[PDB]
Symmetry: D2
C-alpha cells in the first residue's frame, strides 16, 4: 500500500500517506460528504455546495504544511514523522463531529432539543474518532507506521478538544507545546482550520479571500515563551494578523450570518424538532434513536447526515405532515419575513437565558399607530448573534507572540496602540434580527411598527430603514435624532 | 414581486426576472440541488460537489447574455423581451430531466433496467417542465409578463428537445431561427450549456478552463444562411472554436471518463439494479413507483434523486443487503480493480450489440502463461467509451457559419485546411477499459495476462504498461514491435 | 472609423467606441505606457510591472459600465449617448497628468524642486488633455459623433479636476449632478478609478482584492438629496462600503507605503534632483526644459516618463556622475537603511511646516549608550505618512446616501453606530518612518539608539522592535513598560 | 540571509543569499527593462511584464523540481550544491535577451548582422560570465560551498548545452537528469516553459490549461541508456501532448498575433534605420551600436527597450526616419494586414526564398482593373514555423515513462497507444502578407495581388477570399 494524490481546487495536489488513506476510507469519515459546510447558506449562495469532507482534507493538508515548515526551518525542535502524522490525523479528523447542515445542528437544533446537555462539535469529533479507530482496526496500522497508539491517540484527541483532564497535556510534553497551536488553537484562534475555510468558503461563495496563509507559514517560527516552545509570528505581520480576524468577521457578516440563510437554518431546525418523534435512526445492536438522541450512539450518528432533510421531504407518513410542510414552504420560498436588525447600546449585553423573553417583549410593545392586525409573541422570531474575534471581549492579538528580524529567537509582545489607531476599539458585539412568521403585507407592517417601538423602548440602535418602515415611530425617539 | 439578484462563483451577480424566480422556486426545479453534476466524479475529485441546480442557473444566465448581445448589436432582428424570457426559461430548464448521479442514470442505469425504452435527459426535461408548469400555476404568471403560453411553451420545449414530431418548428418561424441555436444547438453543438459546464466543472475539479465564451459572444452576429437567419462567428475565431471541442475532449479525458469515477458509477448502478426490486417511491395518487419506473410518472421522478444512494446505504432491510454491501464497499474503497485500456485499429468499430459478448472474450483468452488461478466471464467488466466532437464522425466546424470584418452580413464557410495542418484528422474514436471484480493480487495478474493476450488477438493497440504487466506476451505481437 | 475590442486581464473584453480609439492613439495618451502605476513598488513587488496606460483603459471601461447601468435602470434620468461618451473620455483621461514613477513625481519630487507651485496630477491631467485635443485634431471627431466641444470638453475637464472656478459646474446642469460622481468623486471618494486600481494593483502585486465593484454597480441608483440628484447605494451595502475603504487602507499598508518602496522612490527623487541641472528636454519650438520645468510645457512633459531614470543611469557625462551614482546604488541594492516606525500618541498631530525639522531632532537626541560613531541631521530621513479614508478626519460614509428596498427613490443617511461597534473610531492617523543614509552596521546601531531615544523624548509610541534594537533605552520610559 | 519575494504567479519565493547577490547586479536588474513579449504589449495591454520577474519564476521552479526529485529519491545523491547550481541556471537563462525580447533575436540581429549566429542562449552565457566577473561572485560561491570552476561550467552547460560519449564536464552521467530541468535539449519539457505559460497567461488575460505541479508530483528519475533521466508516469502522456498543444495555442493567439508581429517588424525597421547613429558606450569608453553591442557585454548591459524611447524622443535629422516610424506606431498608422495562407502538400518554404516572396506577390496579375500598381517594396511577407519544438519530430517520442507496477523501469509510448485525435503532423508554416501602403485603393489592390498569388501557387484559400477578392477566387476550381 502506498500514498495517494488528490486534486483539490483550493490546494492543488495533496499527498496522502497510507495511514491517512486508511482513516479516510471509512464510513465514519466518508459520512462527511453528506453534510454541507455552510448548511442553509447553500440556499442563498448557490456556489456553496461544498461539504465537510473536502474541508477536512484541506485542514489535514494545511496542518501537514505548517508542521513540516516548522520542522524544516528549525531542526532543533526535534519534530518526528510520528508528530507530523499525528498532527495530520488531528487536522483531518477535527470535523468528524459535525451534524446535519453543520452549524444548524450544534448551534440551533441540539441546544433546543437537548438543553440539558452541553454538546460541541469538538466532543462529537473525539467520539466519532474513537468509533472510527475501533470499528476499522486502525491501531495496528498506526503501529505499522511507527505510531504509539496510547500516547498518540491521546495526542490527537487533545489537539481536537483540548486537555481531557501546570502542563495539562499528556499526549506531548511542554517542549512540543507549539504542536497544539496548529489544528485547533485554543490560545488565540490562529489555526489551519480557519485558513482552509477562508480559502474554500470564499472559492465557493463567490467572495474573495484577502488572507495569505502561505505568507504566515513562511514567517512563523518557534520561540520560548514562559517555559513552553510556542509559535511566534514575525513582528511586521501583526497588521495582517488583525486583518485575518477582520476577514473572519466579514465572512460572518456577508455569508455565515446572512439574514435569509439564518432564517432557513431556523425553519429546518423547526422541521427537525417537529419530526424528532417519528424519524428513527438504527444504531448499534439494532436499537432505535431519534435525531436528538443519535449523538448518544456513534453508529447511529454515523448515519445522521443532511439525508434527514430529504427523508422528511419525501415522506408519506401522516405523523410527519407538519414537518414536511415546513420543508415544503422552504422549497416554495415561502419563508418567514425579515423585519429588521438592531443593536444594544451602552454596556448592555443580552444573555442566553433571556433569549426566550424577547419575542414576548416585541409583541408587548405599544406603537402609537393605526394597526389592522394584532400580532402575538409566537408570531415573532428574535435571533441574537454574538460577533467577536473568537475570544469573547478579548483582543486575540494580545495573545500572540512575535519575533524580530534582529533576534529571531526572542519572543516579544505588541500592543494595539503600537499598530494603528484605525483598528477596532471593541472586539465583541451583538446583532439582533427580528423576523415575523405571518407573511401578509398588513402583518408585516404591524410587525415593523412593533419592532421599531421595541427598539425605541429598550434604547437599541435605530434600524437602518427606520424612517421608511415606521415614519410615525422614529421621531418620538430623540436619541435617534 | 421584483427581480432577485443571485451571486454565483462563476458568473458573479445574476439578475433573475420575477417569472424566472417563480419558476425556480418549485419542487421540480429545487430538486436539482440534490443531483451531482458529475456523479461518481465527486468520489475522485473532492471539489466536484456541485449540483445540477447552480449549473441550470448559469445556463439560463448565459442564454440571456447571448440573446441580449445579439439583440443590442442588431435591432433589425426584432428580438422581443418575450423571446429573451423564453430563451432564458429554456436555458434554466434544460437540466430538469436528469436523474440520480446525472449521467450514471441515463448512460448506465436506465439502459440496463429498461432496455425497451429510449430515454434521454432531454425528454425528461420536457416532461418535468410540463409537470412544473401544470403543478405550479405558471401559465397565468407567464401571461402576466406578456408571454403567450401555447406558442411560448411550445418554443421552450422545442429549444430543449427539438422538433416535436420544410421548417419543422412551431414555436418560432425561420426569421428567428438563430434563437434555436442558443440553449441546445442541434446544428453543431456550440451552445451556452457547454460554456457554463466548462467554466463551472473546471472551477470545482481544479482544472483550468481555456475557452473564452465572453469573447465568442462579443464576436457573434447573425447572418443569412440558405434563407435562414443563423448565428455566425467572426472568421478569426475558427481556431478557438476548434479548441472549444478540444477542451471538451480534454475534460472527458481528465475527469468525466476517469477510470475510477466510471467504475464507481458502475458499482452504484449495480447496487441500484439489486435494490431495484425493493425501494418504493410514491407517485401520483399513492401509486407505488420504482427506481427504474419513476420516469413514467413525473410526481414520482420529482422525488428520485441522489438520496436513493443514502436510502440504500442506511437501510436495514435484508432484501436490500445485496445492494447495501456494494455501496459499503465503495465507502471502504474496495473497488473493482483497473486492468487496462486499449483501442481498436484500422476500420474496427465495436458496436453496441457486442458489449455484452466482450467479457466472455477476455475470459476466453489463452495466453500461454502459468496461472495459479483461471477467471470467468463474470469477473470482467469491459467498458466501451465513444469519444467524439459531438457529431459522430463529423467535423462540427464544417457546420459553422462565419463572417468577415469587411462584410459583416455575409456568411461564409471555413474548411479545416484553411486553419491548420495540426488539427485532428479524425473526430471520433473508441476507448476500451477493462476491470476485474476479483481484487486479490493473483487474480489481478491473471486478469492482466488474459487482457493483454485479448488485445493481441483482436489486434487492438498495445496497452501503455504492456511491457511491464505482461512481459511474456508482448513479444508475440510484431505490430507492437 | 469603427469600434475596437481590447482584451484586459482584469475586465476581459473591453469595447472602445471609435472616438475613444481616436483619443487613445496619440502621443499624449500612449505616453502612459512608459510610467509605472506603483513606481518604486515594482522594485519590491516584481509582479507590479503595470503602467498608467492599462489602468486608464480600465477606468474608462468602468466609468462606461456605471453610467450605462444607471441609464438602463433609470431611463427617467435622460442619460444620453453623449453623456456616456463624455464620462468614458473623462475616465480614460484622468491619469494623463502623472509623471515619472507616478506618485514619486507628484508626491516627492515636485514638492521639493518646485515648492512655489501647487501642482497636482488632476491639473496636469487637464493641461495634458487640452494639449491632446489641440495637438491631435480631436474636436471635429467629437462633433462627428454628436458631441458639442465647448460644453463637453468643459464637462470632461470638470470631471477630472472639479469646477474651473449654487451649482458650480458649467459642463452639465443640476439634473445631471450624479454624473460628476463617477470618475472622480469629490463628495466621498467612491469612484471607478479606485475600483480599477483595487482590482489591477491586486492582480499584479499578488494580493487578493476584497471589494466587489460589480455588486456595488448592481445596487446603485440615483435619488434626490437636497435638491441634487446623487448616486445612492442600497442600505444593505453600508458594511461593504466601510470595507471598501478598509481595503484601500490595507493596500496602502502592505504595498503603496511599503518602507522599502518608499525609500527607493526617495532615492530616485534624490537622483532626479541631482540630475536636474544637466538633463535637457526639448519642448515647444526646439526650446529646452528641465525635469523640474517639464510641467510648464506640455510638449516637453509629453516626453517626460520613466525613461529619465534610464537616461540618468546610462549617462557618461561627468556632470551626471553623482545622480548616476545614486541610481547605481539602487541596482546593487545599497539602499538607505530603515531604522524604524512610530506614531504620535493621544491627540497630537505633526504639522507639515515641522517635517523639515525632524532629522535634526533625531540627531539631537541623547541616548545613554556608548557609541563610536556620531550621526548628524543630514544622515537621517524622517518620512511622515498620513493614512486616512480620503477625507482627512471625516468619515466618508457620513457623506454617502442610501436607499431602502420599500422606498428606493427615497434617500437616507446611515451613521457609524447603526452599523457596527467594531469599525474604526478615527479615520486619520500618521506613521513616522525613520531611515539612516549611512549603511554600515555601527551607523545602523547608533541610528537605532538615536531613533528610540527620540521616540521616548517626543512621547511617541514604542516601536515594535524597541526592546530588541534598543534594550538600553526602552526601560527608561514607564509609559512603554 | 534569505529574502522572500512575493510573486503573483508562485506566491512567496524564498531566495538563498547567493541568489540574492546574483540578482542585485546591473547585469540582472537590466532585465527589468526588457518586455517579455515585446510588441505583444501593444496588442494585449496586460502584457507589461518583463524578463526579470520571469527569470525569478524560472529559478524558483528549477529549485522546486530538483528539490522534489531529491526528496522522493535520496539514492540520487542530489546535493545542496546541485540545488543552488540548478537554481542559478534557472535564474540566469534569460540574461541574453535584447530589446523587446524575440524581436531582437528573431528579427533585428538576423538582418543587422546576417553573418553571426547569435542566440539568446549564447548571450545568456556571455552575460552570466560578465556578471560573475564584474561583481566578485566566485568568492561568494565558494563561501556557500560551491566550487566555481566545475559549477560555473555546469551552470553554463545547463543554459546553452555542451560547451565544446558523455559531452558534459559540469556533472557526470549519474547526474544527467539535472540537465533536463532548466533547458531540456532532449524534448523541450523544462520549467522555463512552465513559468512562461502561467505568467504570460496571467498577463495576457487568457487562461493556462497546463498543470506543472501535477507533472512535478508524477515525475521520477529512471535509468535509460547508461543515463539517469527524468521519466513521467505513463498516464500523464495525454497531458504532455496537451502541454505542447497549449504552447501552440499561445503562439496562435498571442505570440504570433498579426498586429503584434507587424509592430515588432516596424520597431525592427526603426532600429535598423537608427543603427548608425545610436551610440552605446562599452568597455574602455569605446562606443558601440545597437547591432554591435552584443560584442561587448558592458555595452549590452545598457541595451534595453529604452532604445525605443531614445529614438522616439530624439531631435536629430539623422534619426528622423527612425523616429517617424516609431511615431506612426503611436498614431496606430500601422502597415496593413492583407491576409494569411499556408503551403499545401509536403512542400515547404525555405528561409532562402523568404526575400523573394514579396517580389512574387507584386508580380501576380489579377484580372481586375486596378487604379494603382504596387511594387515589391510595398509588401511584407512574414513566414512563421509553427511546431512542437523539435522541427518535424514528435517530442513525446523522446519522453521516458514509468508504470506504477514497476516505477524504476523506463518505457516508451507511441502516438497510436494514446489517441487517434492527436495531430498527424507536428510542424507547419504560416504565411502572412502585409501592405505598407495604407490608403484604401492600395489595400484593395493588395488584396487582389495576394489572392491571385495564393491561387498561382496553389496555396490555401484565404478565409475571407470570396469577400476581399470576389473576382479572383472563381478561377480556382478547388476553392469551388
Ligand atoms: N489536474 C489533474 N488532476 C487529475 C488528472 N487526472 C486525475 N486527476 C485527479 C483526480 C484525483 O483527485 C487525483 C488523482 O488521480 P489519478 O488518476 O492520478 O490516480 P489514480 O488512482 O486514478 O490512478 P493510479 O492508481 O495512480 O493508477 O488527481 C489530470 O489529468 N489533471
Ligand atoms: N459578493 C457578495 N454577495 C452577497 C453579499 N451579500 C449577499 N450576497 C449574495 C447572496 C445572494 O446570492 C445574493 C443576494 O443577496 P442579498 O442579501 O443582496 O438579497 P436579499 O434577498 O437577502 O436581500 P433583499 O431582499 O434585497 O433586502 O448576493 C455580499 O456582501 N457580497
Ligand atoms: N482571449 C483572447 N484574446 C485575444 C485573442 N486574440 C486576440 N486577442 C486579444 C488581443 C486584443 O487585445 C484583442 C483584440 O484582438 P483582435 O485580434 O481580435 O483584433 P484585431 O484588430 O487584431 O483584428 P481585426 O481588426 O478585428 O481583424 O483581443 C484570443 O484568441 N483570445
Ligand atoms: N502577500 C503579501 N506580500 C507582502 C506583504 N508585505 C510585503 N509583501 C511582499 C513584498 C516583497 O515582495 C515580499 C517581501 O517583503 P517584506 O516586507 O516581507 O520584506 P522586507 O525586506 O521589506 O522587510 P524585512 O527586511 O524582512 O524586515 O513580500 C503583505 O502584507 N502581503
Ligand atoms: Mg481619487
Amino acid at each position: 500500500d502506498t500514498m495517494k494524490v488528490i486534486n483539490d481546487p483550493i490546494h492543488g495536489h495533496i499527498e496522502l500517506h497510507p495511514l491517512l488513506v486508511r482513516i479516510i476510507d471509512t464510513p465514519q469519515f466518508q459520512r462527511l460528504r453528506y453534510i454541507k459546510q455552510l448548511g442553509g447558506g447553500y440556499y442563498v449562495f448557490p456556489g456553496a455546495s461544498h461539504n465537510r469532507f473536502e474541508h477536512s482534507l484541506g485542514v489535514g493538508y494545511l496542518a501537514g504544511c505548517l508542521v513540516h515548515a516548522l520542522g524544516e526551518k528549525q531542526p532543533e525542535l526535534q519534530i518526528s514523522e510520528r508528530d507530523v502524522l499525528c498532527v495530520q490525523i488531528a487536522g483531518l479528523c477535527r470535523n468528524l463531529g459535525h451534524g446535519p447542515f453543520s452549524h444548524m445542528f450544534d448551534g440551533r437544533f441540539i441546544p433546543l432539543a437537548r438543553p440539558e446537555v452541553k454538546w460541541t462539535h469538538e466532543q462529537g469529533s473525539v467520539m466519532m474518532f474513537e468509533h472510527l479507530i475501533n470499528s476499522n482496526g486502525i491501531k495496528p496500522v498506526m503501529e505499522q507506521y511507527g505510531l504509539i497508539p496510547e500516547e498518540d491517540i491521546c495526542f490527537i484527541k487533545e489537539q481536537i478538544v483540548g486537555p481531557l483532564e501546570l502542563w495539562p497535556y499528556k499526549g506531548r510534553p511542554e517542549n512540543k507545546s507549539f504542536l497544539y497551536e496548529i489544528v485547533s488553537n485554543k490560545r488565540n484562534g490562529i489555526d489551519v482550520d480557519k485558513w482552509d475555510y477562508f480559502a474554500r468558503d470564499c472559492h465557493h461563495l463567490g467572495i474573495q479571500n484577502n488572507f495569505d496563509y502561505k505568507r504566515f507559514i513562511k514567517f512563523a517560527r518557534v520561540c520560548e515563551v514562559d517555559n513552553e516552545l510556542r509559535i511566534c509570528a514575525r513582528d511586521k505581520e501583526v497588521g495582517n494578523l488583525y486583518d485575518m480576524f477582520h476577514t473572519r468577521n466579514s465572512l460572518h457578516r456577508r455569508a455565515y450570518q446572512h439574514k435569509v440563510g439564518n432564517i432557513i437554518d431556523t425553519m429546518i431546525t423547526d422541521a427537525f424538532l417537529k419530526a424528532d418523534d417519528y424519524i428513527e435512526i438504527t444504531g448499534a445492536g439494532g436499537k432505535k434513536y431519534r435525531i436528538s438522541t443519535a449523538i448518544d450512539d456513534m453508529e447511529a450518528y454515523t448515519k445522521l447526515t443532511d439525508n434527514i432533510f430529504l427523508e422528511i421531504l419525501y415522506s408519506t407518513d401522516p405523523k410527519l405532515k407538519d414537518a414536511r410542510e415546513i420543508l415544503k414552504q422552504i422549497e416554495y420560498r415561502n419563508l418567514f419575513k425579515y423585519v429588521g436588525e438592531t443593536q444594544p447600546t451602552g454596556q448592555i449585553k443580552i444573555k442566553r437565558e433571556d433569549y426566550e423573553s424577547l419575542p414576548k417583549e416585541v409583541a408587548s410593545a405599544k406603537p402609537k399607530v393605526l394597526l389592522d392586525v394584532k400580532l402575538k409573541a409566537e408570531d415573532f422570531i428574535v435571533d441574537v448573534i454574538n460577533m467577536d474575534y473568537g475570544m469573547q471581549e478579548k483582543n486575540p492579538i494580545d495573545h500572540v507572540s512575535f519575533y524580530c528580524k534582529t533576534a529571531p529567537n526572542r519572543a516579544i509582545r505588541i500592543t494595539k496602540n503600537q499598530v494603528s489607531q484605525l483598528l477596532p476599539e471593541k472586539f465583541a458585539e451583538q446583532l439582533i434580527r427580528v423576523y415575523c412568521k405571518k407573511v401578509d403585507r398588513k402583518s408585516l407592517y404591524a410587525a415593523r411598527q412593533y419592532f421599531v417601538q421595541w427598539c425605541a423602548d429598550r434604547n437599541f440602535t435605530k434600524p437602518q430603514d427606520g424612517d421608511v418602515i415606521a415614519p410615525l415611530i422614529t421621531p418620538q425617539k430623540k436619541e435617534w435624532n
